[PDB]
Every structure is written in C-alpha cells, then in structure tokens.
Write a protein that binds this ligand. Structure first.
Ligand SMILES: O=C(Nc1cc(/C(=N\c2ccccc2)NO)cc(C(F)(F)F)c1)Nc1c(Cl)cccc1Cl
Lengths: 52, 1340
C-alpha cells in the first residue's frame, strides 16, 4: 500500500512539475521518514527474467 | 569559382557536362522528421494527423467527451552539446491542449461544463539534429529509412510449385497500412476462396453475404444474363451475336426463316458477322439445351406459392416443365464459358455452407475467434470493426491511391476504409485475371515498394501510445464525477514517453550512427532496410527480393550493399535519388522534346518510367545536343537495346545516378569487377581518420560534396572577412548585403575540439582559414576529422610498387617501409571513455576517496587529494584513474594467515579496492574528467574544483560573446552616425556607452539607430539570463540510477600508429594486413634514389579482377609527377610566369575536356598559393563512368617526365643490384580500416567463470577463452588425440574441480589430468531427473 501511495503522487506531480517530481519530493509528500523512498523504490522492483 | 577553390583546384577529366549537380545528401533524413513534428492545419502526416485520428475521445454513451485542441514543443531542456556530455536525451516537452466537455444528460447537446485544461504534458519526444541524427543517451543515433510492400491491392501468380498440376493459381491480397489483411485465392477446382489474414480458408461468397448480398445478387454481380423465352410453345432464346465466339454449335442454329449455322459447325467470325448484320435478336432453341444451364434468380409458382427452383441451380428437362406450366415466360440463366467468362462464383456458392447474412457472420466470427459461442452483436461488431471501422483500419493515402490505381479507377484519393464496391471490384479483377484479361504484379518492382523514414515510424509509435492512452481515458470517463478531475488526472506521461523511448532506444532500425568517418555517417543516414517492423526477415524472404531489379536504376545503388547474412536486403539510396510525393522512389531525367535533348529536369517514379524510352548517360551529341548516332543504346520497358535516333523521350541526367555516394567515390570504377567494387565501397566506410588529414591524390569529385554535406566540417553561414581565427573558435565579420538590419552582428563559430566519437576514434576540427581572409558564403571555415580543404580525405596516398618482395606480401599481405611509421601519417588517435561507478551496498556506501588500501606512493601520486587523475597526465595499463573503495567487512581469515597477521601486525582493511584502472595494455593521455553527483549529496573536493573551473570558463566565454558582439554592434552605429551626422575624430573621443544619445537628421537612419539600440539592450540582458542558466546547469546534480551515489568519467586519448596485424585497403576492394615493418634500408628504390613506401603483390591483381587499382596507380604516379615538377619550380623560385604557364598547361591536357581555367585569378598573390598547395601532388578528379582514359594518363605522364609504361627500373635496397624487368610504381590512395590488431588480439589463461554452468566467461574485459565447437571437436577426432579433446572439454573448461587441480599440477611441474565429470552433463542429469525421468549411472 505504501508503494501505491508513492505512485499516486507520481501521477499528479508528473505533469504538475512539468517533468517529474524530484526523488525527494514525494518524500515529504508522504507521511513516514521520507528518506525511505530510495529504499522502498528499490525493493518494490520485480527481478528481471534471467532468461531475458 | 569559390574561395577555397582558389586554394586548391582538382584537375577534372571527362566530357559529359553535369546538367544537374548533386543535391543535399542528407535530404531524406531531415525532410522526414521535418514532416513528423510540425504544425499542419490539415490531415497531412504529422503529430497533428495522429492526434486527429484517435481524437476526439468520447466515453461510452455517457456523453463525457475529451477533445484535442492544439500542441506545442517546448525548448530543449539541454542543448545538443550539454546533452551529449551529460548523457541525457535531446528532446522537447510535448504540451497539448485538451478540452473536457460534459454534455448535460438528456440532450439537445449542450455542456453543463467544459474545462479546458491548459496543455497537459505527455512525454518528451526526441529531436533530430541539423545533421539528421538523434541523441538517445548522450550518443548520436540514426533511424534508418524502411522499405516495405506498399499498401493497397496486389495480384500474384504462385504458378509452378503449388500442386504440381501446372494449372497455376491466381491470388489477390489487400494489404492495409494498419488493420487485418484481406486475402483472396483460387484452388485447383477453380473455387474462389477468401481468408482474413493468414487464418482459415473460407469460400469467397461467404464474405459477400456478410455485406448483405443474397445469392441472386451475387450471381447478378459476377455473371451475365441469358434470357430464355417460352413464346408460343417449345422455348426460344435471346442471342447476342458475340456470345457464339469460342463455342461450337450444339444444334441447328436458325432464325428469321434462314439457317445461319448448322450442327457441328464451330461459330467463327463469319457466322458472327452474318448474325450481326442480319441482326438476329431472337432464335428458337431445343428444350434440351437448358439441361446444363444454371438459373440466375429464384422462381416460384404464382398459384401454389412454392419455390420451384433456388437461385444458382442446374436446370433439368423436368424442372423446365415444372416451371413452364406455372405460367412462366422468361427464365434468366448465367452466361458461362470455360474459356472466356468462367463459371467460378457459381461453384463457389456450391461450396458455401451458409445461406443468409447472419449465418455468414456466424461462420466469420467463429473463424476469427473460434471455439467461443458466437453472438449477433458479436459477429456484427467484429465484421464491422475489421475493414469498415475508421478506428481499427486504414490504408491511408498511399494505400487508397495504389488501390484505386491498380483497379483502373479515376479517383486518386478516397476513404481510409473498404467499401462493398471495393472488395467487389477486387474480386472482379481477380476473376478477370483468371479469365485471361489483365496481368499479375511482381513485389520486387520498386513501384510496389514504398520507402518510409524516421518521422513516419515515430508517428506510428506515438500512435500506439495514443491508443493505449485512449483506453485509459475511456476507462476513467466511465465512473467519473463532474467538476473535479480534468484532462490531467486521466492522461499519464510514462505510457507515451516509454512508447517513443522504446522506439528510439531499442529498434533494429534505430542504431548508433557509425561515426568513424565522414563517409560512414553520410552513407549510414542514406540507407534502406527491408528488415525491422512491417518487413520480412533474412530467414523468410528468398533470393528474389534480395536481387537487383531494373527498377533499381537511378533509385538504388546496385553495387553498394552489405555482403553477408543479409545481401540486398539493405542496399543504399542512389546519388540523385529522391523520395516520391507518395513515398516511392524517383530519379532525375532529361526531357527530350522533338529531336533536341533539353536541359530541363524531370522526375519519374518506378511506374512513371515504365513506358517511356530513356536514353543513355553515355551518348554522343553535339552543338544543340542532337544525337550523333542514327541509333543509340537505350532502355524502355524492363530491357535495353539499340533505339532509333529520335524515338527517345528522355535521357539520363548524369553518368553517376545509377550508383551511390559510396561507389561514386571509387575512381576508375568502370575498370573494376562488381564483386571487388562492392567490397571496396563496403570497406571505404571503415576507414579510421588519420592524424594528418591528407587528400585523395586520385579523386572523383564527389569527395567535396561528401565532406561538406556531412556535418563533420564547419561551413560559413554567411560570407565576409575573418575578424578572428583560433584553434578554438572562428569569428567572421558579415557583409552588409547578407546582414540583417537589426543587431548588426558577426558570425561566431565555436569549433568542436578533441572529444569522444561513437567508434572511440577522435573527432576534432581545425581552422582552414587564416587571420583576415575573405570568405564566400557557404565555404568551408574549417575541416573535421578526415577532411582536407573542403574535400574528403579518408586516408593517405603514398608510393606503391608492385613486385613480390621475399614472400612478405604473400596473399593480400602488405609490406610497408619504416618511412611511413616514422612520418606518423597512418597514426590514429583513439578517445576512450572510461567510467567509475560509486554504488550502495548493504555493507555500506562506496567512496571515491584517494585513500586506497595496498598501494605505493607512486600509485597515489597521479591522483589528487580526492582520488581522481589530473588532466593531462599520461597513463598506461594498470594506472589508477579513479580511486574507489567499497566496504567488505570481516574477511574471515584462516589459521596460517592469522599467524602471519600476528607476526606482521597488519590490520586487514574493512574496505576492498574497486578503483577504476586503465585496461591492460592500452596507453594514452587524459584529456578530460567529469563528475556526476546525486542531487543533494555533498560534492567532493575534486568535483568542486572542476565545478568552479567550469563556472569561471563559462563566465569568460559568455563575456567574450558579449564583448565581440557589442563591439560588432557599436561599430555599425559608428558607420551610420557618420551618414548625416558625420564627425570623424569628434565621435570616437567621448565614451562609447554614451553614443546612444546622439541622434541624426530626419531619415530612416534614425530608425536604424533605434533598431541597433533595441537589439543592443536585448543582447545585454540575454547575456545575463544565459550566464544564470549556464551556472544553474553546472551546479545541478544530474539524476542517476538507483543505488549509485556518484560517477566519475575519465577521457583517455590513446595514440596508436601502425603495427603488423592492422588492416589496410584501397578503394578497389583489395584488402591486406601489414606483414612486416621494413627499414628504409631494404626498400626497393629507383635510379633517383627515392625509396618506395609500400610494396604490394601483383599476383592479387589478375585473379580478383580489379584493374582500376592499377590505373589508379598509374594516374597517381603521373599526378605526383605534376607535383614534383612544380615542387622543383617553387624551389627554383622562377617567377609567376613560368609557374602559371606550367600549371595552365597541366590543366588543359590535349583536347576535349570540361574543366576550364585561370588568369581570371590574380596573377601574383593567388596563383602562387595554388602552386604552393599543388607541390604535394596534383589532385585529379576521375568521374565514375566518365573518368579518364589511358591516352590521357600517358599524356600527363609525358608532361610529368615519367615513362609511358608507368614502370621504371628498381634496385633492391639490400644487394643494390637491379631488378630484372620493369616494375609498376605509382601513388595509390590507401585507407586504414579499424580492425587494428591491438583491439582484435586476445589471450586468456584462467579467468572468471559463469555461475549457472561453470564455463570460462570474461567479466573483467579479460576475455573468455575461444569457443571450441563441434567442427573443431571433429578435427580432433580425425587425429588420434583423445587427451587433447578430453582436456579441451573437461579440465580446461567445464570441470569445476579439474581446472584448479590441473593448475596446481601445471605449477608443480607435473603434466597430467584428473578429469572427473563436466558440469554441463552433470546439470543435464539434474534437469532430466527434475522431470518424471529417472536417469542413473550403472556398474563400476
Ligand atoms: O529484370 C529483368 N530483366 C533484366 C534485363 C536487363 C537488361 N538491360 C538493362 C540495363 C540497365 C537497366 C535495366 C535493364 N537486359 O538487356 C538487365 C537485368 C539485370 F537485372 F540484370 F540488371 C534484368 N526482367 C524481369 C522483369 Cl521485367 C520483371 C520481373 C523480374 C525480371 Cl527478372
């Protein structure tokens, strides 16, 4: 759910900021300590198929 | 004549005047993208078009509509250079106005509210540079134009191979630009069939029923009517006299009380004429003739109301009786002939399982989406959404065009969807072809071949993006509230952005520009491909499409195309070729009206060129240009032969246009076999730029156009005098006539300096002009890599001797003197970009710090306090460019190591050395360093130093701009003030800043002063904003990948000259590898004592037939002759007279050439410069097929003092004795391809290994071992070597144990092996056993 919340911000703030919000923007936009972005944004990603 | 043409002139042989001169070679690339992104106030192809297609997007019935208004492309976030350095994409934001309207429920249609959301941002789109290139990640890239089957209808044969009955077949295919394919095909039984796409075969009529056509109307469409009358009793027949053609009388044919034909007499033209003039409309026929006839329409009994016979049913003698007593007079039947008009559709109906429209739609919907239960709305929606939907289907303009044209229609433009009339007409055409009237088209023909390009394809991808955004728009407009959301929350960015990014980033057609060479770029940007999306593959299309077609003439170069897996699947665009209005290929011609050959140009497409008879590029005409011969070689339709003096409609424009720019650079091409010519023009693109750009000594005259049109050089935007010349920049003062009234101004050119090229070679520009020199508009202001004085030098000419020298030249091998490696001419500069990545591991962050565990003082010496190598420091293999250290804690050592540490008291570091070190064996000098930092992490010491430095340099640059510009502007005010206000000495006294107050007498010059004021202040503030922006661009942290904190890029410039193993070749397709470097001592020389640079092998000449390389030698020699003579006369310092005389004499050369000449040139300061540039040799231009002749070359040799044979006496530099027989010596232009041996060479003992299966794999750039294949294995099997093979596939590779256990023995001095079982097979056991299969190893 925390990841999804980070997607929501990306949506509006994408066109709103004219390019995309800075990696630390959605941080203060979100409740928790906000440095967790880089962390949360990492573990979220699905592993690339090794057979690619 | 131009200004650099006074610097150097190329002597041009050849006769044929050039009526049309070579256009911009980059034409196609720029035009395409120019059409893609642009504002077009109509449906013409562009972003506008693709927008208008999908838009307006409306919700489902909910009357919430989203319509498109207008769009704009914002200024680039980074310019070309900055974006190239940083590595981002050169692009523009796409801002599009969207109007969201909500109709008040229960129309009349009016909106409760309509919010116009201002320009919602969707994606950024790449931009094409003036050179026709794109930058994806910091790298110049090119999108190759595509060649595919043009949309519309096509009729084929497929004779032969199918069924082996020889009966052939006839099929038609409708190929839309987008949407499902529509296919029609016959079969051996002559039953017409139809299939959508490649899907299941269905009887043809089944589609007709889906268009709502009952049987009666199908028959009425495809067959004529034979009328039967039961007047009085016992029948009759309506007879059209032409109907009896191709048939024999079945009975007595008699009418009008006169017997026209008897039984058993075939009806000929005679009987038919007799019937025609006597005009017999009605004849009497037997009741038995209708026994085979097929009744056209349905027939019912008026009384009983029952169906007597169905439409398309065979009549019998009894059925006639049953419908006759019912009161039926007329009976319609099909007009059927097994020769002229065939009874196909009838039998087609006989194979049709369906009856009505609904039934047909059922079978169709069950055909396309089989197995799932059909529905009425489902079949209807499908069939309506296949070929009839404006959305899911279109042929566009080219499609509808070719469609209608092939159908013999009038309208050149029509709807983008199929109509009943269309499908029907197509079927009719196919039936006509089966009937014998009409012919089948071929794919290979360039009229059926369409050429796309960057813009069109980009438009297609953006279209896909727009449809996938459409689905989302409707999806959201489903449940939406009223006045809350707007055209923002719906439309996303990533979907479109990645849609374009996926195209430019990864596509078979999108590739990295090959920039090792000015020819390579320009010949890459002009290229065609039958591969990629919407095209065939190498594994599919056979020899036909690959092969050269007569339509390729003037459109596509026959001899330029890659030799390999795909041959002729690429080709190239020809010299004078152009993209047709509809997207076909058209070539220039010369209209011949009456008997005169006019100089008017005319462009003809592949289809246009067909009927006309075109004359030859090589033909003799004189005076008014009338053909000298009574018959001349020409070509009309598909073929060439002798043609009458005036039958000729047109003629070739040039002796070139058949070939391409690659082939047009091959001198004496006509003397070379096409194979070796192809190889030559293929390798000509591989030439690495030399250290000193030289010049071709033997040319063509295209090399000027190549150099200029390609962006490698720097051309003057406007003409004038050079105010300033630096190796860095060049400032030209503009002439007034070309100059604009406002801003005054001078043209400033910032030259590209030493920087990385895509191929790792060097790209650098040097000024070809000096301080205070007159320059013409559109003249070279400087040369790029491999360019000289406005021409193209891909390499260096040099002295060559043909003779076997001690077998050192053995196959193609080349024996070169030391004179060449000493003169450093063939030397090359490589620029390698090396990277250092600071990442984040769970153990901790990685530091770029100069503090490195386990290194000497000499190791940390070349690094600064921050750990980055100084600019300019020369380095070799093993040197540390960037110190980097990553945490690895608790090494977990072993007992003996622990004792070791206890004795030596060494703290084992918690940090491991990841530092970027120069790759092994390569050596060069550091020309630059960059530091990319995550925005918000503190910049280290070095990075800060660099940043401050860049800031200062920027301020200095901008200040220079403003200074030169301001002085340039005020210098005009000084000049305008003097007119009407003149004070010479009075004006320049007072401060310049205060000049703006002074006025002038009433005139337009006052308003000019005003202009200069406005533009002056504009510049003054523009400086400010530019400085601000530059500073911000410098300071901002670039966005990096996840986990990486900072990145350090070091730019190494390596200089490698030449060594044995390098590849060298002429333009003639003669390869070679430098064998040995031989001292100037052992070099074969002549009586004059001048040694030879290179010794080739004569044996290579006869076999592979390229004789041009010899001619190129001869003329070359002769050319150098004219140089040497001049070189003496300049060293003799005779005078202007003698020199000029000799030069003119050289430029005339016997009789009949098109060159013309001097003494319009200043006889002193100008001529003496030309002679100064000619002393290196006399540059000659040999046109492609118009080139020089033996007699001309021998004559030039006479002028040169050198023998006719081109052969002289040569003495061995060893014994000093003469060589028996004369040897051919001369100057052959030779290139250096980049195959260079210090790249190719690899060696590995024990490297890293693959995880999944343990096998040698390079991870370090330390290369994986050579691959031992099946064939090599067989080679071992043929010999008796078992142990070599075992050690090959076990211990040296696949055995995780055997390798190390081997290594220990190798160092121990024991050669053995303890093989064990290869890990491959060991894994195979597990994979097999992972299934339901038990695999075991028996016995012992
Ligand atoms: O291409 C065809 N003939 C054909 C004729 C000639 C020819 N003269 C020509 C000379 C110059 C240009 C065009 C034709 N002959 O005198 C040359 C070729 C060539 F491919 F080798 F260059 C093919 N025939 C043909 C046609 Cl018309 C249609 C489809 C396939 C073929 Cl194979």
């Amino acid at each position: 759910e925390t990841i999804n919340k980070l997607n929501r911000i990306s949506r509006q703030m994408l066109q709103e900021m004219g390019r995309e919000p800075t990696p630390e923007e959605l941080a203060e936009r979100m409740l928790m300590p906000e440095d967790k972005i880089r962390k949360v944004l990492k573990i979220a990603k699905e592993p690339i198929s090794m057979e690619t | 004549y131009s200004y650099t043409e006074k610097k150097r002139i190329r002597k041009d042989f050849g006769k044929r005047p050039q009526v049309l001169d070579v256009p911009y070679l980059l034409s196609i690339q720029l035009d395409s993208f120019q059409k893609f992104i642009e504002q077009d106030p109509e449906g013409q192809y562009g972003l506008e078009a693709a927008f208008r297609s999908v838009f307006p997007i409306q919700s489902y019935s909910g009357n919430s509509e989203l319509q498109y208004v207008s769009y704009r492309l914002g200024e680039p976030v980074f310019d070309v250079q900055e974006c190239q350095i940083r590595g981002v994409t050169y692009s523009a934001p796409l801002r599009v106005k969207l109007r969201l309207v909500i109709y008040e429920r229960e129309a009349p249609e009016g909106t409760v509210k309509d919010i116009k959301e201002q320009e919602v941002y969707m994606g950024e789109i790449p931009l094409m540079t003036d050179n026709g290139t794109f930058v994806i990640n910091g790298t110049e890239r090119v999108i190759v134009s595509q060649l595919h089957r043009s949309p519309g209808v096509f009729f084929d044969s497929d004779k032969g191979k199918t069924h082996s009955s020889g009966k052939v077949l006839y099929n038609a295919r409708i190929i839309p630009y987008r949407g499902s394919w529509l296919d029609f095909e016959f079969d051996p039984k002559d039953n017409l069939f139809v299939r959508i796409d490649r899907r299941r075969k269905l009887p043809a009529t089944i589609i007709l029923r889906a268009l709502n056509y009952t049987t009666e109307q199908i028959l009425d469409l495809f067959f004529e009517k034979v009328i039967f009358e039961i007047r009085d009793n016992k029948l009759q027949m309506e007879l059209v006299p032409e109907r009896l053609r191709g048939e024999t009388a079945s009975f007595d044919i008699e009418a009008n009380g006169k017997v026209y034909v008897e039984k058993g007499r075939r009806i000929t033209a005679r009987h038919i004429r007799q019937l025609e003039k006597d005009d017999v409309k009605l004849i009497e026929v037997p009741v038995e003739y209708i026994a085979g006839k097929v009744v056209a329409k349905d027939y019912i009994d008026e009384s009983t109301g029952e169906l007597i016979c169905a439409a398309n049913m065979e009549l019998s003698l009894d059925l006639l009786a049953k419908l006759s007593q019912s009161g039926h007079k007329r009976i319609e039947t099909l007009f059927t002939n097994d020769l002229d008009h065939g009874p196909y559709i009838s039998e087609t109906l006989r194979v049709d399982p369906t009856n009505d429209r609904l039934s047909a739609l059922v079978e169709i919907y069950r055909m396309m989406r089989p197995g799932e239960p059909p529905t009425r709305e489902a079949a209807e929606s499908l069939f309506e959404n296949l070929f009839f939907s404006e959305d899911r289907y279109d042929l566009s303009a080219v499609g509808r065009m070719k469609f209608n044209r092939s159908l013999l229609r009038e309208e050149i433009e029509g709807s983008g969807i199929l109509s009943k009339d269309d499908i029907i007409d197509v079927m009719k055409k196919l039936i006509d072809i089966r009937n014998g009237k009409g012919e089948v088209d071929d794919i290979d023909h360039l009229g059926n071949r369409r050429i796309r390009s960057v813009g069109e394809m980009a438009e297609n991808q953006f279209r896909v993006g727009l449809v996938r955004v459409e689905r989302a728009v409707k999806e959201r407009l489903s449940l939406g509230d009223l006045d809350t959301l707007m055209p923002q929350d719906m439309i996303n960015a990533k979907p479109i952005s990645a849609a374009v990014k996926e195209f430019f980033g990864s596509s078979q057609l999108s590739q990295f520009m090959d920039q090792n060479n000015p020819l390579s770029e320009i010949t890459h940007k002009r290229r065609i491909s039958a591969l990629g999306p919407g095209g065939l593959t190498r594994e599919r299309a056979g020899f036909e499409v690959r092969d050269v077609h007569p339509t390729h003439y003037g459109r596509v170069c026959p001899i330029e195309t890659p030799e390999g897996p795909n041959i002729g699947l690429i080709n190239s665009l020809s010299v004078y070729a152009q993209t047709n209005e509809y997207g076909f290929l058209e070539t220039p011609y010369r209209k011949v009206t009456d008997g005169v050959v006019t100089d008017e140009i005319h462009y003809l497409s592949a289809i246009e060129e067909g009927n006309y008879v075109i004359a030859q590029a090589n033909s003799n005409l004189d005076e008014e240009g009338h053909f000298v011969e009574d018959l001349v070689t020409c070509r009309s339709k598909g073929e060439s032969s002798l043609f009458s003096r005036d039958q000729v409609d047109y003629m070739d424009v040039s002796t070139q246009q058949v070939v391409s720019v690659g082939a047009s650079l091959i001198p004496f091409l006509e003397h070379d076999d096409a194979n070796r010519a192809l190889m030559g023009a293929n390798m000509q693109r591989q030439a690495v730029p030399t250290l000193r750009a030289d010049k071709p000594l033997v040319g063509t005259g295209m090399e000027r156009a190549v150099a200029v049109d390609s962006g490698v050089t720097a051309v003057a935007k406007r003409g004038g005098v050079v105010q300033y010349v630096d190796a860095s920049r060049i400032v030209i003062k503009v002439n007034e006539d070309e100059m604009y009234p406002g801003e005054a101004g001078i043209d400033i050119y910032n030259l590209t300096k030493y920087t990385r090229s895509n191929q790792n070679t060097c790209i650098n520009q040097m000024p070809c002009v000096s301080l205070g020199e007159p320059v013409e508009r559109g003249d070279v202001l400087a040369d790029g890599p491999s360019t000289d004085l406005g021409e193209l030098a891909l390499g260096q000419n040099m002295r060559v001797a043909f003779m076997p020298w001690n077998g050192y030249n053995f196959e193609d091998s080349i024996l070169v003197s030391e004179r060449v490696v000493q003169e450093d001419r063939f030397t090359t500069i490589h620029i390698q970009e090396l990277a250092c990545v600071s990442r984040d591991t769970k153990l901790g962050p990685e530091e770029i710090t100069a503090d490195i565990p386990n290194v000497g003082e000499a190791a940390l010496s070349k690094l600064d306090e921050s750990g980055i190598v100084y600019i300019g420091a020369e380095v070799t293999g093993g040197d540390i460019l960037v110190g980097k250290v990553t945490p690895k804690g608790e090494t977990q050592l072993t007992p003996e190591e622990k004792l070791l540490r206890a004795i030596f008291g060494e703290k084992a570091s918690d940090v491991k050395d990841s530092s970027l070190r120069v790759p092994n064996g390569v050596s060069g000098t550091v020309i630059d360093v960059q530091v990319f930092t995550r925005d918000g992490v503190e910049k280290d010491k070095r990075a800060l130093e660099i940043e401050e430095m860049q800031l200062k340099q920027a301020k200095k640059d901008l200040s220079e701009e403003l200074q030169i510009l301001e002085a340039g502007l005020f210098s005009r005010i000084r000049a305008v003030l003097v007119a009407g206000g003149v004070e010479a000495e009075k004006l320049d006294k007072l401060p310049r800043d205060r000049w703006l107050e002074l006025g002038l007498t009433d005139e337009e010059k006052q308003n000019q002063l005003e202009q200069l004021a406005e533009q002056y202040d504009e510049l003054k503030h523009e400086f400010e904003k530019k400085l601000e922006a530059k500073r911000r661009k410098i300071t901002q942290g670039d966005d990096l990948a996840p986990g990486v904190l900072k990145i350090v890029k070091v730019y190494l410039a390596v200089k490698r000259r030449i060594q044995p193993g390098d590849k060298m070749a002429g333009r003639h397709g003669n390869k070679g590898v430098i064998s040995k470097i031989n001292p100037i001592e052992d070099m074969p020389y002549d009586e004059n004592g001048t040694p030879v640079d290179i010794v080739l092998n004569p044996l290579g000449v006869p076999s592979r037939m390229n004789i041009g390389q010899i001619l190129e030698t001869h003329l070359g020699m002769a050319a150098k002759g004219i140089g040497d003579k001049i070189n003496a006369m300049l060293k003799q310092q005779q005078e202007v007279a003698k020199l000029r005389e000799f030069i003119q004499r050289a430029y005339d050369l016997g009789a009949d050439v098109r060159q013309k000449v001097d003494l319009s040139t200043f006889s002193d300061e100008e001529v003496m410069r030309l002679a100064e540039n000619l002393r290196k040799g006399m540059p000659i231009a040999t046109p492609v097929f118009d080139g020089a002749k033996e007699a001309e070359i021998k004559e030039l040799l006479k002028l040169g003092d050198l023998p006719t044979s081109g052969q002289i006496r040569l003495y061995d530099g060893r014994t000093g004795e003469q060589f028996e027989r004369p040897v051919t010596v001369g100057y052959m232009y030779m290139l250096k391809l980049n195959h260079l041996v210090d790249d190719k060479m690899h060696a590995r003992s024990t490297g890293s290994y693959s995880l999944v299966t343990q096998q040698p794999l390079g991870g370090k750039a330390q290369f994986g071992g050579q691959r031992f294949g099946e064939m090599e294995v067989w080679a071992l099997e043929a010999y008796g070597a078992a142990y070599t093979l075992q050690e090959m596939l076990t211990v040296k590779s696949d055995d995780v144990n055997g390798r190390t256990k081997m290594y220990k023995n190798i160092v121990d001095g024991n050669h053995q092996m303890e093989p064990g079982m290869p890990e491959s097979f060991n894994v195979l056991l597990k994979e097999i056993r992972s299934l339901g299969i038990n695999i075991e190893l028996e016995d012992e």
